[PDB]
């Protein structure tokens, strides 16, 4: 049993966007599907529900026409009719138990998809190596700067180096761009340590080997 | 919905109880669910129908209440419980279903002073006309404050801080602090200082441009 969200991306305000939740391992017609979102730095927010077991639908009292929810046989969708910056958020779909009595027990969730609402254009990151200016171990890193939208992914030595890796939450610049850093502590070697940066929105993939 | 204000604090192995209050009675007097929420992870159902524990959810978690007053109780608290907790009110009309404001639980483990590292901007970063100096405070508790100094002078602008969530094993934070300057500013000065303060304790890290 699994839920997978998709469709999140950077959109200009007013430009309609449809998010999709794809279902596997169970049948939608035996349950109900629920949309929830979370804007950055805020709380969970209930958006709406569509039933499969019965034929019913509801939007949050405050929706007022901001969302459309519909189903296929293996998906449920969420259309943001006219997106504002207030709709910039991570969107989750969830499966609840259902009957004539309504729904309950939201015990299955997708991983979420990110909607970014801005008048800007997608932009790849710049990557800079981080190195200290006589120790047994050493900490190196990568600064990932000036990208949009989120997220980027950072790995070290193609995912083989995982111990001692610290990646920090991103920071939104006043420019609207984002930046983050990631560091790794290793047993000081003559060995080369390389960070691997990917930015799916611009199909960007950058590798940087960091010297000590 | 009104929840216990954030933040709320609990010691490891201790007991914490957070509460949720609704203006309206929930469906059948008991439609209220509890969720754990950590950054970059979907909501996780802990309690549904006020007191019923989700499949595979630790017996350390329990809930109670009726009508409009509800609690979640976490006993034998672990660092892994460091999270934000949300209540969901379910009502006769689905359109009324609402999340509470969320209650951040901070878990107090063993105090650790931070490991502080400073990284000069790489050569290729200076070429761009802007430099970012990175200071990192690793594996610490409780919270810290950061001070930047350039040739002795406390810096007042250009500073950004980003703190990781608590470590799920030892309750510690990681923090990155960046100082952003123009290349001209950076090359016109010599000493760059990151000062991380934790109570009456300070850990200071420095480098001199030129030794780089």
């Amino acid at each position: 049993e699994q839920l997978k969200e998709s469709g999140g991306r950077l959109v200009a305000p007013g430009t309609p966007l449809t998010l999709t939740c794809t279902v596997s391992g169970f049948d939608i017609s035996d349950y109900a599907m629920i949309w929830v979102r979370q804007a950055p730095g805020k709380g969970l927010e209930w958006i709406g529900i569509i039933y499969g077991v019965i034929n019913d639908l509801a939007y949050a009292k405050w929706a007022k026409g901001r969302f459309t929810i519909s189903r296929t046989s293996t998906t449920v969708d969420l259309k943001i009719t006219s997106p504002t910056t207030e709709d910039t958020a991570t969107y989750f779909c969830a499966r609840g138990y259902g009957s004539m009595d309504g729904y309950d027990r939201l015990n299955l969730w997708g991983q979420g998809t990110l909607v970014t609402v801005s008048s800007g254009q997608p932009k790849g990151p710049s990557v800079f190596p981080l190195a200290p200016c006589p120790s047994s171990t050493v900490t190196l890193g990568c600064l990932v700067k000036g990208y949009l939208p989120e997220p980027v992914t950072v790995t070290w030595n193609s995912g083989t180096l995982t111990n001692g890796v610290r990646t920090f939450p991103s920071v939104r610049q006043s420019s609207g761009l984002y930046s983050l850093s990631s560091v790794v502590s290793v047993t000081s070697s003559s060995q080369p340590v390389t960070c691997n940066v990917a930015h799916p929105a611009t199909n960007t993939k950058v590798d940087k080997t960091v010297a000590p | 919905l009104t929840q216990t204000p954030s933040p709320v604090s609990a010691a490891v192995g201790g007991t914490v109880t957070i509460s949720c209050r609704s203006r309206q009675r929930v469906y059948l007097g008991d439609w209220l669910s509890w969720f754990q929420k950590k950054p970059g992870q979907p909501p996780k159902l802990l309690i549904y129908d006020a007191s019923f524990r989700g499949d595979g959810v630790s017996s350390r978690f329990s809930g109670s209440g009726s009508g409009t007053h509800f609690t979640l109780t976490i006993s034998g608290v672990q660092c892994d419980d460091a999270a934000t907790y949300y209540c969901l009110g379910g009502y006769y009309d689905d359109a009324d279903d609402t999340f509470g404001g969320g209650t951040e639980v901070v878990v107090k483990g063993d105090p650790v002073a931070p490991t502080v590292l400073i990284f000069p901007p790489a050569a290729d970063q200076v070429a761009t006309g802007t430099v970012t100096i990175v200071c990192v405070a690793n594996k610490y508790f409780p919270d810290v404050t950061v001070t930047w100094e350039v040739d002795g002078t406390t810096q007042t602008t250009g500073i950004e801080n980003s703190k990781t969530p608590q470590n799920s094993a030892d309750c510690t934070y990681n923090l990155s602090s960046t100082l952003t300057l123009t290349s001209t500013q950076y090359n016109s000065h010599k000493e760059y200082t990151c000062k991380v303060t934790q109570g009456t304790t300070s850990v200071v890290q420095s480098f001199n441009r030129g030794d780089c």
């Binding site: 019965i54 639908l57 009957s99 004539m100 | 359109a95």
Partner: peptide, 5 residues
């Protein structure tokens, strides 16, 4: 059956 209410 009340459904979604």
């Amino acid at each position: 059956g009340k459904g979604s209410g």
